[PDB]
Design a protein around this ligand. Structure first.
Ligand code: ADP
Ligand code: ADP
Ligand code: ADP
Ligand code: MG
Ligand code: MG
Ligand code: MG
Lengths: 360, 344, 165, 49, 359, 366
């Protein structure tokens, strides 16, 4: 029985190989009292007196001691399994620094004593869940957004683009614009409330300027949300202004281009002979791509950029929030994957030189 | 409203906290400025807004279950915002509308027709318009400090009093049951005054009494049954009521109800809806910034029986004339009903 | 902070309940579904209440729904500590989480109510890993399945013990 | 008196949406300083290479 | 055999650990002629001396007089030697750390107690109620405190203080009893009024409606017998005196009622924990023993709180001495003997030891 | 002659363009009687409410920089034009100030009242942080204003503002005044009524200061009486305060004293700089400008320099610019801007607003 653990910036999904959905999904949050530590949903329930901190910021480890707490919470508190009795499949961000991968390998083999372990690129696993071997995966998670083109199973690192704009930036932007309506959220506890608001009432408009016009001359686009303490707040144009930062990073003062142009630019960096198939296999992944209407807006924007003769097809499966995890479960069940396993007895005699190879 | 304009219509029984997602009458594309219930139909309300239109709505007997955006009649005749709306006291389906374009229009909601157009009578902004007792005339308050009595059907100026109040602040004018004009305004020294005018002799007012030196326009509420005028100031925390009699000085201060919170709006319940058995002669709905607080005005009486003297016959919910009859030139008084049947 | 310690028997039961080891099916039926903790006679240590446990094996054969029979196990006029292994399904996941339950009925004596309350924050710290806490001060706050479901996932919970709410 | 009387003091520009623009036009590279564009209510004329 | 002393604003509660009720309950006053009288002795002389409250508002302001109360407590009231028994003391919320050390210094150097401990009164009341999270509104004699508790730790930024309690109500009842022709002005008459207040006063669910009932009949009239045999009758004053708690404007106080103060303290806490506090409001102190105080509080807070939240007011029948009773059972536990501040520890760390061990 | 109006949470400064100091500085309070009159005006605004506060209930129309009740807000403006400045608002154009990141709904009400209620001929709204930079004669610097309701940190580089780097702190003079009361009850002095709010606030403005080393100042105050000062109450009673002099302002640097999770003003200023581009952080370190009345404590500049230096890299030069008139920096900057010959193109006419609406005031401003 193999374990699949996909460590994201905000959510850490864990489960067992061969399953269809993650058995354990909890926020990657370490909370400490401000009036000795709480991790995950136990921090989420007591966040009234806790100072919530994310151990991952922009896909970068800021505190490895908190990271071990997240992993300790997965094995013993959520999965309820012994890490030394199950092979564990890890997921890594594209262009993952070899220093970051080594620490992941070192912790798993020395602190948790796992028998077998393997690290896979999140973009590759996202394509397995869709049953494809060719296409560009735009995985937008909590910390960072990546565009990884893939052709016939071959990865092209030179065409991988990174956008420092993801779910956390949208959540912080929603708080900034919510004060324009009169609701003030400042503490880290209120960040989760705003994030909960973003996941329920936000959506991507097909056109932004027109959506401003109807929201400024009609009350059909307003929705009501209930706070934990009972006050009901209403939001109008903030529903689609927050996700618009994905396509217009200038709202956040950022100079880089939107996630539609980043996807197009990553294709433009590929060879000419493969661009046609990448246009027709644009795969969305991550929780930041779960906004209603994000697929239609993506298709309209990329079509305006791509030549008229190319068929833009945005693939947005309904379970794309767990595509990375689902792809990991399928890999951990394939018969051809057993030769990818890295043994503990192999690591202690060889070191991280064997994990830098046998991986990508 | 977040976009456009809307007003909340709820049954009187629905007290307590109101849901923030409660359905509202949101059909206007701009903020709604004035609303007024039909005196002959308890489920019909007209609304004027910034979108230069008047919308007449039909409210279900149990209220709103879903947001109401389609009105019965969309009544478009103004080039600027419409902030004044006044139903005809006795003519059925006859509505008055005055916009910021200084034009007064009398309409027919039943047929969506424009009965009369009065555009060359008000040279400046119109403050308020009030019908007379039988609906024959109306008085208007204009930015040029002038009070005008205008016959709508003939399009003539019956009378005019220039510089009714010397102040530059907004001033109001209402018609009394006897036919006199009651006006509130400001002096040259920015002192709030009340005035009583005789349409036959407009040289000087009978009464001119000053109240204070506060800001804000004074919204008068006249009760024809008791001849008591309630003066409510926007932003004031007090309500002053006066009695209008034929003896000098024709304006008699009764008392003042004082509170600790300023009012943002003000609403008066018509005579048909008061608790007749508790000697309640006026019920006022004081509008705070986030709350509506009813205020009960009662006459202290030892007897628990019905008070004939306090409660004469009042106008009912049935109309005397109709739109085509009033246009012809007929005049009639509103039909008086009896409040004795409401005693429990 | 009453200074009441937690007995090693309670600790050992907690690790067995929390971490599931790869075991043969006969040992799986021996896993604890519910368990009650009460004070010792000298009121110095938190001990296991003997005989008041529900095993996984009894579920489906002698026990129809473990939650209702677990509530009947709670005394009417005495405080107890409870550990319940809740199996529930969300709209997108199936979860198996442990719930720590504080049973403090109003009918309980004042001395019993005080000591359990004054030592709750000490026993809970030793039992690291519990992420649901249910403080029930009356029988109506614990007998309802929906009350447990509300703590588990709020409104996202769609089933409990394989039965729809 | 304080402000000069006019009707156009608040005129603002607003570029048209992308789908209503005209892309892939090889605009002329002639150094001559002309308008390079003539438009009437019917057609659009652009000098190209 | 430990000693538990509850230094209240107006009454001092003392007793032995393990007992169900305090042994001695006496006023905490010092009498000096207009030579030093403490407690009931100061009140037996009535008007010859002037009375001072050293802990008039939960916080000790005159330590010289406070030592006299403790000396009177140990030798005259408890009738035991302080040097042979550990002493558990109660402290008001928002008690400065300076007074905590001064309490430690006096206990060990003046009375030579073998051991000591300091506990917050609000925390014990919640613990006695069988809860670790909730808001305790402790209405005593000189001050009313609303103390929200989360996991046994007070939130100091959200604790509100009200200078409206039984002392003010007793004076107000004295003021309104003169409208019936009675004369209660002397110190001895003040104790009689307090006895009337504790026996006949109740909180009306609807204040204005209750006035109509009391002004149209005599079913609400009660008779009270004075110590010298004269009988007085009181009518609407039964519910008018405790109404000042919810309408401080009756006393000329601008502050809000104790129902709004409880609501305001909840609103000062974090948004995530307000739901628990709404359902875990616990009453404490003598001033909350008026019949009909819980239902009126439930009705008032509900009108302020959002309609989607469950308001539950907890009013245990022993809430008058819940602070002492909770403290007494603490000190009677065998596992609590390791929490005593030993004199050996005080001799090493000084008075500052109370901060790291009594928190 | 243009009017410059700076309406703060606690104080309202007004004057004429071209002057060097505000002509009218009065508290932004509205008082209403709480007793009954027995001897044969229902509200008081400004200094007249401060003098009669013994029988009034003082209310601040602005709290945390948001307007709680607009009806009293108009009274503040009405008192300003007619009673303090004693001018006709329909004759002089008015230059108004707004907090950074001001909601457009709040700005819409502010201009609508001016044009419709007071009938001002022209109007303009400017960001308070911008004028505070004009008073110091700079084009680059991070302005940390601290008034009565809120604290803003606005970095501006070469006349370009960075909205994404603007940070907010819900901690200002009013919160410190409330905190001083909580610690004053520790010494035995009880201040509860809104009338006593101005008494405690006056104590804070006269006896409070910022200690360079907070822990050392506790040690000195706990073993000596050199730090104790005496203050006379309006009724003649004299009270003495010790360590409360510097404990109250310490909430600005340690918001945990108020139970707040946010960081201090020094870290908020540092975090604002780090949100900017790397190439402009060097100039922002050397052009830290203080503004507002809450930055008038003695020794606040020295403590600010020490704290930011410990956070910033050693090679950067920290300069805390604290002009002695920083209490009126926003107004002084407003008068300077309203007098420049290049500002007359920014005026918004009353006629233009009538035919266009609030669409033109959202533009032409920032
Ligand atoms: N239904 C939804 N709509 C919009 N955003 C969502 C939704 N669900 C999750 N998110 C956002 O997606 C972000 C990242 O989710 P996820 O893909 O799990 O990130 P990671 O890959 O780092 O685990 C979260 O910050 C969350 O706010
Ligand atoms: N049965 C009662 N009904 C009403 N009030 C009471 C009752 N018993 C005591 N009190 C009031 O409680 C006050 C003191 O109670 P307590 O909480 O012990 O004060 P403290 O805690 O400050 O010592 C007294 O002033 C008394 O008036
Ligand atoms: N000399 C001073 N020392 C300390 N604080 C002061 C001083 N002067 C004013 N303050 C405080 O500054 C606060 C706000 O002043 P101000 O800068 O005018 O704010 P606003 O911009 O809101 O008008 C006041 O509440 C006052 O307590
Ligand atoms: Mg991811
Ligand atoms: Mg007490
Ligand atoms: Mg300011």
């Amino acid at each position: 029985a193999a374990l699949v653990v996909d460590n994201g910036s905000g959510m850490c999904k864990a489960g067992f190989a061969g399953d269809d959905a993650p058995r354990a999904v909890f926020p990657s949050i370490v909370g400490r009292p401000r009036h000795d530590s709480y991790v995950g949903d136990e921090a989420q329930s007591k966040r009234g007196i806790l100072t919530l901190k994310y151990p991952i910021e922009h896909g970068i480890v800021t505190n490895w001691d908190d990271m071990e707490k997240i992993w300790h919470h997965t094995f013993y508190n959520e999965l309820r399994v012994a890490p030394e009795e199950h092979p564990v499949l890890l997921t890594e961000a594209p262009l993952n620094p070899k220093a970051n991968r080594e620490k992941m390998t070192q912790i798993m083999f020395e602190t948790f004593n796992t028998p077998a372990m393997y690290v896979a690129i999140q973009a590759v696993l996202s394509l397995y869940a869709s049953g494809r071997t060719t296409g560009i995966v735009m995985d937008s998670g909590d910390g960072v957004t990546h565009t990884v083109p893939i052709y016939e199973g071959y990865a092209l690192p030179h065409a991988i683009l990174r956008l420092d704009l993801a779910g956390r930036d949208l959540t912080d932007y929603l708080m900034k614009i919510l004060t324009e309506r009169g609701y003030s959220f400042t503490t880290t506890a209120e960040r989760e409330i705003v994030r909960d608001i973003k996941e329920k009432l936000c959506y991507v408009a097909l056109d932004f300027e027109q959506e401003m016009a109807t929201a400024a001359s009609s009350s059909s686009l307003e929705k009501s949300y209930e706070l934990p303490d009972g006050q009901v707040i209403t939001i109008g144009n903030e529903r689609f202004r927050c996700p618009e930062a994905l396509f217009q990073p200038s709202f956040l003062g950022m100079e880089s281009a939107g996630i539609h142009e980043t996807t197009f630019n990553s294709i433009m960096k590929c060879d000419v002979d493969i661009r046609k198939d990448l246009y027709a296999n644009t795969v969305l992944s991550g929780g930041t791509t779960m906004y209603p209407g994000i697929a239609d807006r993506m298709q309209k924007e990329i079509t305006a950029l791509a030549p008229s003769t190319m068929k833009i097809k945005i693939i947005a499966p309904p379970e794309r929030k767990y595509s990375v995890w689902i792809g990991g479960s399928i890999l951990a069940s394939l018969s051809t994957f057993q030769q990818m396993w890295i043994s503990k007895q192999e690591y202690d005699e060889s070191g991280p030189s064997i994990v830098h190879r046998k991986c990508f | 409203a977040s976009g456009g304009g809307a007003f909340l219509v709820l049954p009187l029984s629905k007290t307590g906290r109101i849901d923030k997602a409660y359905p509202t009458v949101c059909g206007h594309t701009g903020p709604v400025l004035d609303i007024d219930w039909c005196p002959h139909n308890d489920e019909v309300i007209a609304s004027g807004s910034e979108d230069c239109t008047v919308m007449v709505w039909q409210i279900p007997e149990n209220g709103l279950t879903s947001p109401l955006t389609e009105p019965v009649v969309v009544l478009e005749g103004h080039t600027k915002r419409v902030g004044i709306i006044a139903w005809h006291p006795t003519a059925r389906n006859v509505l008055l509308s005055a916009g910021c374009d200084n034009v007064v229009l009398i309409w027919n909601v039943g047929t969506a027709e424009e009965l009369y157009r009065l555009d060359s009578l008000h040279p400046d902004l119109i403050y308020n318009v009030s019908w007379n007792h039988n609906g024959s005339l109306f008085c208007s308050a204009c930015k040029d400090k002038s009070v005008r009595i205008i016959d709508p059907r003939r399009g003539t100026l019956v009378a005019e009093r220039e510089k009714a109040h010397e102040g530059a602040r907004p001033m109001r004018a209402i018609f009394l049951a006897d036919g006199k004009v009651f006006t509130t305004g400001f002096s040259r020294m920015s002192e709030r005054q009340l005035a009583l005018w005789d349409p036959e002799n407009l040289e000087e007012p009978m009464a001119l009494q000053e109240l204070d030196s506060s800001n804000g326009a004074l919204l008068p509420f006249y009760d024809p049954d008791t001849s008591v005028v309630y003066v409510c100031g926007k932003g004031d925390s007090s309500i002053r009521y006066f009695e209008i009699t034929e003896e000098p000085p024709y304006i008699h201060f009764l008392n003042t109800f004082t509170s600790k919170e300023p009012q943002r709006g003000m609403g008066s319940m018509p005579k048909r809806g008061l608790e007749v058995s508790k000697c309640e002669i006026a019920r006022f709905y004081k509008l705070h910034e986030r709350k509506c607080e009813p205020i009960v005005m009662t006459v202290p009486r030892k007897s628990d029986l019905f008070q004939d003297d306090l409660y004469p016959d009042t106008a009912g919910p049935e109309a005397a004339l109709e739109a085509e009859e009033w246009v012809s030139g007929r005049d009639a008084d509103p039909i008086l009903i009896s409040l004795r049947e409401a005693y429990v | 902070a009453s200074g009441v310690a937690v007995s090693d028997g309670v600790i050992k039961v907690f690790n067995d309940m929390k971490v599931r080891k790869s075991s043969t099916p006969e040992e799986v039926k021996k896993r604890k579904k519910a368990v009650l903790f009460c004070l010792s006679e000298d009121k110095k240590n938190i001990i296991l209440e003997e005989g008041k446990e529900i095993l996984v094996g009894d579920v489906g054969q002698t026990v129809d729904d473990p939650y209702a029979t677990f509530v009947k196990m709670l005394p009417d006029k005495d405080c107890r500590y409870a550990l319940y292994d809740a199996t529930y399904e969300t709209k997108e996941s199936k979860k198996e989480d442990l719930v720590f339950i504080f049973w403090a009925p109003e009918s309980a004596p004042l001395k019993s109510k005080m000591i359990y309350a004054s030592s709750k924050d000490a026993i809970k710290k030793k039992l690291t890993g519990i992420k649901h806490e249910l403080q029930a001060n009356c029988y109506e706050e614990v007998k309802d399945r929906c009350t447990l479901a509300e703590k588990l996932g709020g409104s996202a919970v769609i089933s409990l013990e394989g039965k729809p709410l | 008196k304080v402000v000069r009387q006019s009707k156009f003091r608040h005129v603002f520009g607003q570029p048209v949406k992308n789908d209503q623009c005209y892309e892939d036009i090889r605009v002329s590279r002639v150094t001559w300083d002309s308008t390079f564009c003539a438009v009437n209510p019917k057609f659009l004329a652009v000098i190209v290479e």
